[PDB]
């Protein structure tokens, strides 16, 4: 839509993904108009980790999907689990904070 597909492929690498995610509020479109709904956002990037090394992931970016699966409607424990499940070749789609 106006999103960035960022991939944290490891290819047999030790280097962790090294990022955190958190609960937030995102605004989405509806028949009622613009509504505040629960979202998932990037908390911070760990120095040395692959997430930082891309230069595309940034703090307060919204997680849209994880490897093709939209995270809307899902809790933070679920999304975390989706990401660590796919941790070898993780593909995040985000809406950049700016």
């Amino acid at each position: 839509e106006t999103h960035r597909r960022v991939r944290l492929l490891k290819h047999g690498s030790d280097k962790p993904l090294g990022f955190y995610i958190r609960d937030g509020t995102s605004v989405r479109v509806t028949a009622s108009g613009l509504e505040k709904q629960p979202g998932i956002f990037i908390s911070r990037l760990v120095p040395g980790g692959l997430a930082e090394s891309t230069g595309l992931l940034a703090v307060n970016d919204e997680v849209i999907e994880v490897n093709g699966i939209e995270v809307a409607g899902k809790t933070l424990d679920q999304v975390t689990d989706m990401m660590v499940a796919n941790s070898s070749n993780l593909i995040i789609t985000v809406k950049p904070a700016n």
Binding site: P16, L17, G18, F19, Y20, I21, R22, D23, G24, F41, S43, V46, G49, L76, D77, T80, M83, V84, S87, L90
Partner: peptide
Amino acid sequence: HREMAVDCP
């Protein structure tokens, strides 16, 4: 806002 870590050492 509560947070959780994806693969952190």
